[PDB]
Homo-oligomer: A and B are copies of this chain.
């Protein structure tokens, strides 16, 4: 049974960094070297301020850095010494050409593969950690075969990450499962078992799942699509609740108590966001089109169409409730990050709701307790931002003289605002549009104050 003693991870982002930090934390006898072409990131990892924020990560990095955890820009030597090379580079969506807006951009993966084989001799295990399209491993193998040397024996595995941002360390220390895919040949199984042996230092054997290479790559895409589909499904029910007098929280509770469905990922919202869900579902749809599977492609495209409809429908409700005109009206946008307790705005629903209201000429005053001013301007920019967008320092200034308060992110503090004070200074009639159900239970009090309050999945009354 082959024992991995040296690990090299190419890519110092939110996938490679935390995973390779935890491996080093759990495997004292393994040397872990994280390398990246971006010198700023590598220096930041070796600095007192880490380039990504995850609870517990700063502690983990400080307990191993300098013993068996190393960050370096010397990509060549780290590859040369390693028994195992992780490919953890970014796979952004193509913004150009074939599959624009949907397909993954593979240029970083292929250059990474070419760098590895150029710098490798003898036996190494090469592992895809970044989210790759299915059959990527076949391409990496072909690059290795075409650039082969005497005694060179590079084994290619798949080992996707399933951590969700905000709980990376907890998820890496106690994963629901570890997924490792490899060829079903004797060489592939030896390599798979060698990688299993690393994770078995802290993960129970029952939570380590081994599959073939293609299953492992597809499982990562399928898993995120199934999760996004749960949200789009309950969001589709919220529209039906608004039309019938049902209440989407009561329905979601009743549904989730069926133990075959479970009670997670059933919170209706103005739409899901973040850098993973839309990107992975769109990648799955593109894959299906490329494989002549249009029925499957249109099946998964609905998850995205429903998400787009949930956002557009919420913006239209605002415009319709405000007497079908919002031009020059001050509107407070409370919450800009894609979810609470983060500064991340990527694919945030607040961006799309804001753009829809900007397209009507609304004067938006935007408050978020964590997102910086500069990021909000960028997210809403391509001049229109100058005319229409104000970034408020506190929620009450955002609401002063407003026609409506639009809650787009479920920050806990929005439940605690002084709505009596807010009402006095709003123009009348004053509206609250709750896109996150955070004001549930406060509706009776807000109405007696004088607000007209509308929320996702509840009939207006």
Footprint of B on A, CB under 8 Å? 96-98, 103, 105-107, 110, 114, 133-135, 139, 142-143, 146-147, 162, 176-177, 179, 207, 209, 211-212, 214-219, 222-223, 225-227, 229-230, 232-233, 236-237, 239-241, 243-247, 250-251, 253-255, 257-262, 264-265, 287-288, 291-293, 295-296, 298-300, 302, 305-306, 309, 316, 319, 323-325, 327-328, 359-361, 427-429
The 9 closest A-B pairs by CB, nearest first: A219-B254, A215-B250, A146-B429, A177-B257, A211-B250, A260-B264, A214-B246, A97-B360, A146-B428
**Contact sample, A vs B, 7 pairs, CB 8 Å cutoff:** A143-B429, A176-B259, A211-B250, A226-B233, A240-B287, A262-B262, A302-B302
Residues in B neighbouring A300, C-beta threshold 8 A: 236
CB-contact partner of A245 in B162, B212, B253, B305, under 8 A: B212
Is the pair B305, A299 in contact by a Cβ cutoff of 8 Å? yes
Interface residues of chain A: helix, strand, loop or mixed (majority): helix
Is the pair B134, A219 in contact by a Cβ cutoff of 8 Å? no
CB-contact partner of A223 in B96, B162, B255, B292, under 8 A: B255
CB-contact partner of A246 in B134, B255, B296, B298, under 8 A: B134
In the bound assembly, the distance between CA atoms of A250 and B233 in angstroms comes to 25
Residues in B neighbouring A324, C-beta threshold 8 A: 103, 106, 133, 139
Residues in B neighbouring A316, C-beta threshold 8 A: 98
| Closest chain B CB from A265 CB (angstroms) | 5
In the bound assembly, the distance between CA atoms of A157 and B420 in angstroms comes to 34
Is the pair B251, A222 in contact by a Cβ cutoff of 8 Å? yes
Is the pair B296, A244 in contact by a Cβ cutoff of 8 Å? no
